[PDB]
Design a protein around this ligand. Structure first.
Ligand SMILES: [Ca+2]
Ligand SMILES: [Ca+2]
Ligand SMILES: [Ca+2]
Ligand SMILES: [Ca+2]
Ligand code: NA
Ligand code: NA
Lengths: 93, 98
């Protein structure tokens, strides 16, 4: 695999690792998303301070397009887009 | 150090920037830059059926180029990254099944 292929599989592995903990094994609850972010993107999460929990709930509701209170793989793309853009702003600054 | 996922995000960003720097705007992809990015970076994706054919790469570029300026900026590239991650998600499932 190329380094980018290794990167895509790492992201997919990540999603499944957290989604499998509770409820539907293919979807993230808010708590599964919270664990995924705190463990996987700490540089980003560390920057948010007091309003971290407010940010995670806003991100989750924005991603949960069908309002069923869980993130499927397709809805997770929304979160990946936000993470990629945040790390992009870091890649520069 | 950075987590595996953080390393993954930086790899994706680095890849975009490497190809976008070749010609024209150094922060956007020409069709020729996108084509090289895909064939070099995601060969398993490009191996699928007809994705190596001009038709597929030209239609993916057209779909991604939302403002019709004949280049893919970083925000438009997220469209392509979503398509790639969804295809590699099927490959992840086929590998688990084998
Ligand atoms: Ca779950
Ligand atoms: Ca949902
Ligand atoms: Ca360019
Ligand atoms: Ca464009
Ligand atoms: Na899956
Ligand atoms: Na950039």
């Amino acid at each position: 695999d190329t380094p980018v292929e290794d990167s895509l599989f790492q992201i997919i592995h990540c999603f499944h690792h957290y989604a499998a903990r509770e409820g539907d094994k293919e979807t993230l609850s808010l708590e599964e998303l919270k664990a995924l972010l705190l463990d996987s993107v700490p540089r980003f999460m560390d920057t948010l301070g007091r309003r971290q929990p407010y940010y995670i709930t806003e991100l989750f509701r924005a991603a949960d397009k069908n309002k069923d209170n869980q993130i499927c793989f397709d809805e997770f793309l929304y979160i990946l887009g936000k993470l990629v853009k945040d790390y992009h702003l870091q890649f520069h600054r």
